[PDB]
Every structure is written in structure tokens, then in C-alpha cells.
Design a protein around this ligand. Structure first.
Ligand SMILES: O=C(O)/C=C/c1ccc(NC(=O)C2(NC(=O)c3ccc4c(C5CCCCC5)c5n(c4c3)CC(=O)Nc3ccccc3-5)CCCC2)cc1
Ligand SMILES: CNC(=O)c1c(-c2ccc(F)cc2)oc2ccc(-c3cc(C(=O)NC4(c5ncccn5)CC4)ccc3C)c(F)c12
Length: 545
């Protein structure tokens, strides 16, 4: 069937890719899907289901679900919105309860979804706007009641170490490095699917439900999953921001709770089956939704090229064709997944340290847009957290925004940021502890960066007309000195975040308050969607902090 059917009703909104480039994206994401399954697919599916069987999932309370809603979450087309939900207002709560009852009692009627354009700031290179399909706020809260515990527990149970969203940046790197080292002679590749959400057939979505149905579920939770699959997840009518009917969807909705989970499960299912079809030897897989990386045992350049075509043919048969055809790589540092690559530096004692990086052009262009126009959910803070070990995040991002926060006297003001579609509320003052927990103390004392990484950062600054690295070193020294002079977490920010800027470096000891921090949710909800709000809370602060 067609992934989408359009009535021609324009996708109405509320360089930066606007609502006029949304028509180009529509042509790409619209096509009929061909899917042919085989024994490999059925075997992996059965193996997956067997692991799912071990799971027991709890049914969340109205109250529990509400508290997981981001405060910037799209207001209900029923006269309430996010704040009302988060504060458990009689209007919001009573509507959620009705939605839930309707899900328990109505099993066929399609649930309406709103189609919109995501306005992402990219660089002016001399790309069509990404689409966002999501149900009403009330439905989104019910989704959480029924499947939050499933999506939190199930994926790790089924895929183990292959589940991509269970890792802190440091952990992911450690997994990757260990996997590459484990192989006698390793080969690795990244498989990018062309329009993954669109390639997701209605059968894929029912196969996904068959996995959820292996949990020990409450009868209400079971029916909710059943109704949500038929009425919402397999498809339904599309409605623009104005309320006019846009068309119909018969593929994955980006704005649903089961998007990263389902996409992960599906991608994994298809890929693992394709690994068998291509007879790839001793595969280690890492799956982050539509994004996948395979670290297997090399069998020679020509055979590796051959294996990979077989892999692609199988994936294509499973209705998961590639965007770009995969290239076999023989250096871990040469694989690019989630716009990222593994790089290496030295800690304060000269020991090797691997870390994830990326081309800084987009992060910097977006941060530049964000400094100009006030944004509710910023990328710069997410990039600071995600790329804390990187040369560019440390010298340009940390320096620029700490000087700004210093001026505006807003270091203590919690901000909302997105880290690959996930929403987090962070006080910039908590960055050292956050960084220490996600990357380790070495993030604060990395040096001896590769020439390649230094040159990419340098070139990129010239390209964007950003002052050079020597300017940033100078500016960071003022910021450091100012933050130090303020004590507490501010001085910690100066000491730890800006040690790179000082002539003769300080010995850095573990931040004691970093252990108090509870980061549970970050791991158990790392998904590139879900309408999940991860905040920051610390179990019992010691008085002297
Ligand atoms: O060779 C030497 O010895 C010295 C050279 C030198 C060159 C330029 C300066 N620039 C400045 O002082 C000013 N801007 C900046 O000091 C500046 C800071 C951050 C900038 C950023 C981003 C960096 C990441 C966080 C957000 C801000 C961009 N641009 C920046 C400019 C240049 C700009 O204007 N816009 C963009 C556009 C796209 C991408 C980046 C930028 C302020 C007054 C005049 C312009 C200073 C010294
Ligand atoms: C198969 N692709 C991957 O696994 C990823 C690769 C990759 C490149 C080369 C290569 F050779 C192999 C692999 O690079 C990435 C960069 C980034 C991400 C990534 C990281 C986080 C994330 O860390 N989010 C936080 C967090 N999460 C959990 C716990 C705590 N904190 C900071 C908030 C969340 C989502 C994503 C998409 C990724 F998956 C990947």
C-alpha cells in the first residue's frame, strides 16, 4: 500500500527549512511498499519473541503518565495543554480517562493525527523539511500508560547489548571499541535506510505488536496495545495545524511513543535476518532506531563487498532499501553513524581515550541561530552534553554560552534541550557532574587531538566566519576567572569545563556531587521521540554541596 495519500491540503505551520520545502519531502516519503519475508526473518522473529516472553510490564497511572509529559508538548485540540496535564487539571485528567475508556472499548476507529513540518536550522550550502505526525495530547498520555514500561524494559530484553539507546556516550564508545578488538580481523559498516518510517509496512507494525504481546501485561494494557495498533500505529487520517484533512498514513508516525522502540525492534529484526542471508561472520550489531552499525569478522575486501550487496538485497526484500549503499570499513574511526565518528585523544596522564565527534558545521550554525532567536528547546546545550569531550564543544560552544549566561546572570536557570529527539531540562551549573557521569573525568583534560579533527574544526570556523581557536582560548580565560570567583557549581564549571584554557593545568579530582545525580531515565528512555520529558534529580544532597 501507499505510505501516504494526500488530499493536497497544504501542511500549514504554527537558513532554516520552512513550510514551503515540505512539498518536496512529501514526494520522497510517498510510495507503495513491496515486502517479501523468508525463513531467516521468521527465525530471528521467533528468537526475539522468546526473549520478549521474559518481560513483565506495569500499567502506569494517569498521574504517572502526566508527569512524563514535556511542558512544551503540543496542546490538546480539547482546550488543555502540557502545563494543565503536568499539574493534573480536572479538564486534562477527565479527558485522558475518557480517551483510555474509548481505547478499551472501541477497537477499529482510526485515531486522528496532526501532520506538521519540523523547522530545523541547517547550513547555507550553495534539504526538504522533516515531517512530524502525532496524535492528540490525551492519546499521547494514554500511550504512556499502556506502553511506557514496555518501551523501557522490552528492547534491552530482546536485543541485549545491540539496543542502542541504553548507552551513555562513554558506554557506547566502550562497547564499540571492545567489539572491534574482539574480532581477529574486523570489518564494519553503517546501513542507512531510505525513508525508514515510510518503508515500515502495516505488517511490520503488527509484527512489532506480536513482540509487545509476549510481555506479562495487564488486561487493560493488552487491549490498549491492541486498539492503539489498529486505530493509531498501522495508520490513520492526517490533519494539518489548521484542522483540515491532509490525507492518510499507512506507515510509521514519527510522533508516537513506540517510534524509536518499534523502529529499533524492526530495524534489528530485518538486519539480523539480513546478516544470516549475507552469511556475515561473527556480527556485533548496534541499533538506534533506523540507524544501524555492524562490526563483523572480515573475509577479504572483495568477499566483504560481495557480502554487503547480499545484506542490502535482503534488507531491500524486507522493505528496508538503503539511502546510500554501505561501504565496508577497516578502521573503527572511519564508520559514520548518527552523523558521528569515533576519534581518539589523551587524558592528563597520556592514556588513550576514545570519544564520539562529528563535523561541527550544523551544531555551530544551529547554535548561531539559537543565540539570535529565542528557542524553547535548544540544540547547543544538547551538543555540549553529547560532545563534551570534543575540541569544538569545549572551545567554542562552552566558551560562547558560558560568557552569555554569565552576562544574563542565568547560570542557575534550567533550560530545555533535545539530544537526538529526546527532551531534557538542565541547569547549566550541573554540566560538570553530567559530563563526568556520561564521559568520565578525562573529558575535562583531553588533549593531543588528531590532526584530522583539529583541521576539520579549524576549516569549519573559517567557513562560518567564527573567530579562530586562539580567540576562544583568550575568551575562556575570562569566563573561567569569572566563574571561579563565584564559588559553588559556578566555580566547578570554571575549574572543570575550562581547564584546557589555563597555561599550567590543575589536577582534577572526581566531583563528589556527581554520584548523587540520578540519571536512570536517560538510559531507560534515550529514544529519538516518544514525547518523554527527562528532568534532573539528585538522591539526598550532602549539606557541604
Ligand atoms: O585572527 C585574530 O587574531 C582574530 C580574529 C577575530 C575574528 C572575528 C572576531 N569576531 C568577533 O569578535 C565578533 N563575533 C564573534 O566573536 C563570534 C562569536 C561566535 C560566532 C558564531 C557561533 C559559534 C557557535 C556558538 C554560536 C555562535 C558564529 N559567528 C560568530 C562570531 C559568525 C557569525 O556571525 N555567525 C555564525 C553563523 C554560523 C555559524 C557560526 C557563526 C563580535 C564582534 C565582531 C564579530 C574576533 C576576532
Ligand atoms: C548505530 N549508531 C550509534 O550507536 C551511534 C554512533 C556511531 C558512530 C560511528 C560508529 F562507528 C558506530 C556508531 O554515533 C552516535 C552518536 C550519537 C548517538 C546517540 C547518543 C545518545 C546519547 O548519548 N544521549 C544521551 C544519553 N543517552 C543515554 C544515557 C545517558 N545519556 C546524552 C543524552 C542518544 C541517541 C543517539 C542517536 C548514537 F546512537 C550514535
Amino acid at each position: 500500500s501507499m505510505s501516504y495519500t494526500w488530499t493536497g491540503a497544504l501542511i500549514t505551520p504554527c537558513y532554516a527549512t520552512t513550510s514551503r520545502s515540505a512539498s518536496l519531502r512529501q514526494k520522497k516519503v510517498t510510495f507503495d511498499r513491496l515486502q517479501v519475508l523468508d525463513d531467516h526473518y521468521r527465525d530471528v522473529l521467533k528468537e526475539m519473541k522468546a526473549k520478549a516472553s521474559t518481560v513483565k510490564a506495569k500499567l502506569l497511572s494517569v498521574e504517572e503518565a502526566c508527569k512524563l509529559t514535556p511542558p512544551h508538548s503540543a496542546r490538546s485540540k480539547f482546550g488543555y495543554g502540557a502545563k494543565d496535564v503536568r499539574n493534573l487539571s480536572s479538564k486534562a485528567v477527565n479527558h485522558i480517562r475518557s480517551v483510555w475508556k474509548d481505547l478499551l472499548e472501541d477497537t477499529e476507529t482510526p485515531i486522528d493525527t496532526t501532520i506538521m513540518a519540523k523547522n530545523e536550522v541547517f547550513c547555507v550550502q550553495p534539504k526538504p523539511a522533516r515531517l512530524i505526525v502525532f496524535p492528540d495530547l490525551g492519546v499521547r498520555v494514554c500511550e504512556k500508560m499502556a506502553l511506557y514500561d514496555v518501551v523501557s524494559t522490552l528492547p534491552q530484553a530482546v536485543m541485549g547489548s545491540s539496543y542502542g539507546f541504553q548507552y551513555s556516550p562513554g558506554q557506547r564508545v566502550e562497547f564499540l571499541v571492545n567489539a572491534w578488538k574482539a574480532k581477529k580481523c574486523p570489518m564494519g559498516f553503517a546501513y542507512d535506510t531510505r525513508c525508514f518510517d515510510s518503508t515500515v509496512t502495516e505488517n511490520d507494525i503488527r509484527v512489532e505488536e506480536s513482540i509487545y504481546q509476549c510481555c506479562d501485561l495487564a488486561p487493560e494494557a493488552r487491549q490498549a496495545i491492541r486498539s492503539l495498533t489498529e486505530r493509531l500505529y498501522i495508520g490513520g487520517p492526517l490533519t494539518n495545524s489548521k484542522g483540515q484533512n491532509c490525507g492518510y498514513r499507512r506507515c510509521r508516525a514519527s510522533g508516537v511513543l513506540t517510534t524509536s522502540c518499534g523502529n529499533t525492534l524492526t530495524c534489528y529484526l530485518k538486519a539480523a535476518a539480513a546478516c544470516r542471508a549475507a552469511k556475515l561472520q561473527d556480527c556485533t550489531m548496534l541499533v538506534c532506531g533506523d540507524d544501524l552499525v555492524v562490526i563483523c569478522e572480515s573475509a577479504g575486501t572483495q568477499e566483504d563487498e560481495a557480502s554487503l550487496r547480499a545484506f542490502t538485497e535482503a534488507m531491500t526484500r524486507y522493505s528496508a532499501p538503503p539511502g546510500d549503499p554501505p561501504k565496508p570499513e577497516y578502521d573503527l574511526e572511519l564508520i559514520t553513524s548518527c552523523s558521528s565518528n569515533v576519534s581518539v585523544a589523551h587524558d592528563a596522564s597520556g592514556k588513550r581515550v576514545y570519544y564520539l565527534t562529528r563535523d561541527p558545521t550544523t551544531p555551530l550554525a544551529r547554535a548561531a541561530w539559537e543565540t539570535a532567536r529565542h528557542t524553547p528547546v535548544n540544540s547547543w546545550l544538547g551538543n555540549i552534553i553529547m560532545y563534551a569531550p570534543t575540541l569544538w564543544a569545549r572551545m567554542i560552544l562552552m566558551t560562547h554560552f558560558f560568557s552569555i549566561l554569565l552576562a544574563q546572570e542565568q547560570l542557575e536557570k534550567a533550560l530545555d534541550c533535545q539530544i537526538y529527539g529526546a527532551c531534557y531540562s538542565i541547569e547549566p551549573l550541573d554540566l560538570p557532574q553530567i559530563i563526568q557521569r556520561l564521559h568520565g573525568l578525562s573529558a575535562f583534560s583531553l588533549h593531543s587531538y588528531s590532526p584530522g579533527e583539529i583541521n576539520r574544526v579549524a576549516s569549519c570556523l573559517r567557513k562560518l566566519g567564527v573567530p579562530p581557536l586562539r580567540v576562544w582560548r583568550h575568551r575562556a580565560r575570562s569566563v573561567r576567572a569569572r566563574l571561579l570567583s563565584q564559588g559553588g557549581r559556578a566555580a566547578t564549571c570554571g575549574k572543570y569545563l575550562f581547564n584546557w584554557a589555563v597555561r599550567t593545568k590543575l589536577k582534577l579530582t572526581p566531583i563528589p556531587a556527581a554520584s548523587q545525580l540520578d540519571l536512570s531515565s536517560w538510559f531507560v528512555a534515550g529514544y529519538s521521540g516518544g514525547d518523554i520529558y527527562h528532568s534532573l534529580s539528585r538522591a539526598r544532597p550532602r549539606w557541604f554541596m
